[PDB]
Design a protein around this nucleic acid. Sequence first.
RNA 1: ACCAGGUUGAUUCUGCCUGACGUAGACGCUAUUCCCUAAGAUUAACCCAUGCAUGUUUUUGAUAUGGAAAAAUGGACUGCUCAGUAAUACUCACUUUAUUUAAUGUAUUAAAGUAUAACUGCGUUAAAGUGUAGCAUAAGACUAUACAGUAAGAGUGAGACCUAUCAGCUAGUUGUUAAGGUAAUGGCUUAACAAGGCAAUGACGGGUAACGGUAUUACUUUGUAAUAUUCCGGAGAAGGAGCCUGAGAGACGGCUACUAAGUCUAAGGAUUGCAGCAGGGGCGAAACUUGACCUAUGGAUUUUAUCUGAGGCAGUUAUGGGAAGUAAUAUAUUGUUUCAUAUUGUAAAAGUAUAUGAGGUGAUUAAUUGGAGGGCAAAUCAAGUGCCAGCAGCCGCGGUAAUACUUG
Lengths: 171, 138, 158, 256
Amino acid sequence: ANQFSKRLVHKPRNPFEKDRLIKEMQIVGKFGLKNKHELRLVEKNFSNDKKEARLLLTSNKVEDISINSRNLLDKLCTAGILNGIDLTSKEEILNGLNSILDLTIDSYLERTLQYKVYSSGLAKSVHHSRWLITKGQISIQGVVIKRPNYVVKAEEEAFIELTPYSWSNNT
Amino acid sequence: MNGLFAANDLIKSRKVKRRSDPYYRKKILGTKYKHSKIGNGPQAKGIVLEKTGVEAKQPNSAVRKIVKIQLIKTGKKISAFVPHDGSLNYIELNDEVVVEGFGKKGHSCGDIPGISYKVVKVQNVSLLALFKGKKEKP
Amino acid sequence: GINHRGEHKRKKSGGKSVLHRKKRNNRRGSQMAATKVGSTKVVEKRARGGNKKYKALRLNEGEFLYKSGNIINSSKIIEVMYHPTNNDYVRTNTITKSSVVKISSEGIKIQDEEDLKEMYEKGYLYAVINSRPGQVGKAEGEILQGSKLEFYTNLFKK
Amino acid sequence: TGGPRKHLNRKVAPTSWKLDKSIGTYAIRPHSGPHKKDLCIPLAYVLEKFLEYANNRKEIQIILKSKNIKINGKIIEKRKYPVGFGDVLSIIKTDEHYRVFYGVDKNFTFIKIDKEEANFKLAKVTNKKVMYENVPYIFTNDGACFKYCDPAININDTVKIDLETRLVVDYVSFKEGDVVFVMRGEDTGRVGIIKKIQNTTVICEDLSNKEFETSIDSMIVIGDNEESLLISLPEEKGIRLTALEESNLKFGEIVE
RNA sequence: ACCAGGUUGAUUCUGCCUGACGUAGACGCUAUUCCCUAAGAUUAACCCAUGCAUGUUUUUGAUAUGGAAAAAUGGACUGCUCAGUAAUACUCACUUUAUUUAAUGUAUUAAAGUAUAACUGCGUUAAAGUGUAGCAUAAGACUAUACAGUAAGAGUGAGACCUAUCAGCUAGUUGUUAAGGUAAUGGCUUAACAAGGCAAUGACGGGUAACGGUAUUACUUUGUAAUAUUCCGGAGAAGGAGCCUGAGAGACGGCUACUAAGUCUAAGGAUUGCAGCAGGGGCGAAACUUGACCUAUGGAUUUUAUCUGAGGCAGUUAUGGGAAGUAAUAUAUUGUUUCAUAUUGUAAAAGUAUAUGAGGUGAUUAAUUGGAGGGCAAAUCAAGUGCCAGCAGCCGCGGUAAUACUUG
Ligand SMILES: [Mg+2]
Ligand SMILES: [Mg+2]
Ligand SMILES: [Mg+2]
Ligand SMILES: [Mg+2]
Ligand SMILES: [Mg+2]
Ligand SMILES: [Mg+2]
Ligand SMILES: [Mg+2]
Ligand SMILES: [Mg+2]
Ligand SMILES: [Mg+2]
Ligand SMILES: [Mg+2]
Ligand SMILES: [Mg+2]
Ligand SMILES: [Mg+2]
Ligand SMILES: [Mg+2]
Ligand SMILES: [Mg+2]
Ligand SMILES: [Mg+2]
Ligand SMILES: [Mg+2]
Ligand SMILES: [Mg+2]
Ligand SMILES: [Mg+2]
Ligand SMILES: [Mg+2]
């Protein structure tokens, strides 16, 4: 269809496997997701950089080790899935793409604002966070967010608080 | 015909061998415009004329209930199969029906012989819902 | 009315051709205007984007140039002697480009040459037109002298 | 289509006009003028987008009918007037003057200049022949004619127009080792030193000591020497660093 | 970067059918929000009731303080559709010393007499339109070229679907000389002469349910397939032909004739083209309001107040893609939607956002669709019927104990 109306993700290849539904149901109940569909969105972009990580190891260009690969390592580091590395040194750039292949789906699924509340002391359960966010009681440093699947970047991690003027506080 | 400068002899030879594909042969002759039974569409309309039954093939034994209609778009006569139990009691003569196909690429499936169409609507009432009992027939 | 398109002709191989659009106004033609001899008459034309053209229906007293003495003088036009492409124009007296004529030698002051002397006793001399009459609107030409007179006189009626 | 076109579309608009490809559908088709189709911009976009003096269509007519806008020393009140390359526009009020040439990233810029530079103008000769009654003539790029000039000015040399008396005042000849300015091609806005002049291209040297080749029609020499510098240069001076050094300044250089 | 079931008393192969998965249209059942995005292309390039989409401007000033006419300027752009065309149309690379250009920019040159309107006044016909007077009476009309700049015409070469039950084809056809005509090259047209031109590297024929590229989607190990849909280009206004004005029309919300369909009449005559926006009829399996407006982007020769069904803003529809709901902590506590109200906002009205009000419920205002022998996740659970009624894409169940039909 048109660009505004194409679809992003399809059905899996084998609809009924007992060896696939058991593995995935351990992820839904642990992280607290409502649809099987919304799990499929976060794994495809996990596949797409791994499609790009393989090419940069095999590039024979002298500048591709300098530009696009360094433009690969930053984007994960701003969201904070990767921890941090020195971009001036050449040999650690090789280590950065080699560390990329050792990730999982849970490295992406853990930096979500629903789970990141419960891992802090604000929420008791993960289901306590989904019921709390939608009423509008939780705020980042200036903004009041109502989307539990909002990705939390690296620098904005420590500044999660309650809303100061909500009924969840005293006022 | 394996050579570096033999592209003119390779394309001319491989077009001849491609004509023995049984799916590709019907695309060249255009048989779906020439010898189509219903036209080119998902459904059709018709007028009922008879209510008759047929007998299925061996080794099974039953009586399959069908209906002989006449289409509007082309004007031909054709037979369709009533697809559910106790559904023929709704049907009266001099009425309109809607016809849907079986889904086996123009062939007959099951043990019903020579018939490739089934009824879906009677008087703009869904026969799948009317068997469930949600609606009533006027 | 009269087109100058090229879409109607056959191919290089000889196969037929097919059209796909109607007649355009860009390639537009006209009919032939045959300039006769008589009393003078000039009509005007309108061409594409102004640019007026003049056509002459009946022409008289054309201008000619003497090559040896290098002067220009007017003379009358009497008869036509030769026309290259079609030999029927000599009986209908039509003047076109490069068709030799017969002019009066009254106002002309000629030098003393051997060839022109015998015709100069009578009234007539020879000239050849060099301008497009139907589009410029007036005739100009040269007087025959020397071996150029030797070439045309083999083609005369005799 | 039996005649000319009068409507232009925003998607086929030039990207150097810095327009948004958002909600609009049509764009202003400017008038015919001295400049080409590439080096011209409409006037109504200048008072709206680049300069910020008006908000809607009504305030455009207020500044234009008040007769303060002065392009090449002339008052103009038409919003469809094309502003070309190199011309100096000014307001009579507030003594504000600008020169118009491209930036570094193939976009139009406006640079505030001084009143000593506000007088003159630069152009480039393209053709020269002698007209009727034995009078010499020199034809520039924009279409102005000039007679009785110095015979040392050749076909490719540049001139200096006084813009008030409309007389040729100074000229700079065309040779090697001259500072140059480019305005077209894949490389626009480069300022360079001439090293080798070929018959159709020129082999040049950037201020960052690089190299590029460019046809002769796309350049204009602004000075014979580095110390001349007849005009004022832009702030970047047209260096246009590569994407490697843009990747070097962000993250530091690669230690080896 | 992945395979499974089916030929035999059992085994190994070739070979096909079927299951699992995409992309465009139609259909059955069920639906609470918000933002974005789409809607008579497929059959009929079939016929249309009604209403509306092209006029501006002191240039002069209607026995008339601001409007009659006449002049000037644009109606050839914009918008709608895909019938025809297999290449002449389109894309790319070149040429035009072989050509034309109103409105634009810079320069060169030159400088008394003569109509018709509006007005006043006599009329005509069913209608549609038109006539005779007042020596009637106004403004107007009787410079030429260069070089840039936009716009267009004309050439050369290369690329592009199926068919041999289509193997020979072409006579203004191929060339020479000359003329006419065009703004211009050219058998573009006409005289005279000559016999040339193309083909298994597919000529000449036949078919298409064939408008060409492109932005953009899929699937991939050197690349295939779709592309009416965004944008550029070409062709047509019931079917054919011809022409006026004009810088630019072989123009159709301009004129003339013939063919197919009509409509008004007082019977002598007069008249119409919705593949423009709404809307109706027919056709079909198949597609929306006979709605408001110049707010923003534009066009009309300076466009700050004129016009603008181009173009915006709202209503109807499971056309699709997003951010979300229908509970949480241990009967109880707290508190999301279905209700209303301020401000912001709108051309004027919605709507979104920020704040504020009440009432008390998750058996509620707040969940459906398909399946349970194998492929293929899930019952030899119960009651009826007995090769009947029926189910099953393929293999296959139904003969009084059916996990394979009907109900729970
Ligand atoms: Mg199927
Ligand atoms: Mg149609
Ligand atoms: Mg008038
Ligand atoms: Mg079609
Ligand atoms: Mg067609
Ligand atoms: Mg009169
Ligand atoms: Mg002949
Ligand atoms: Mg296409
Ligand atoms: Mg029609
Ligand atoms: Mg038109
Ligand atoms: Mg047309
Ligand atoms: Mg016509
Ligand atoms: Mg019409
Ligand atoms: Mg319509
Ligand atoms: Mg529909
Ligand atoms: Mg159920
Ligand atoms: Mg199982
Ligand atoms: Mg089935
Ligand atoms: Mg089953």
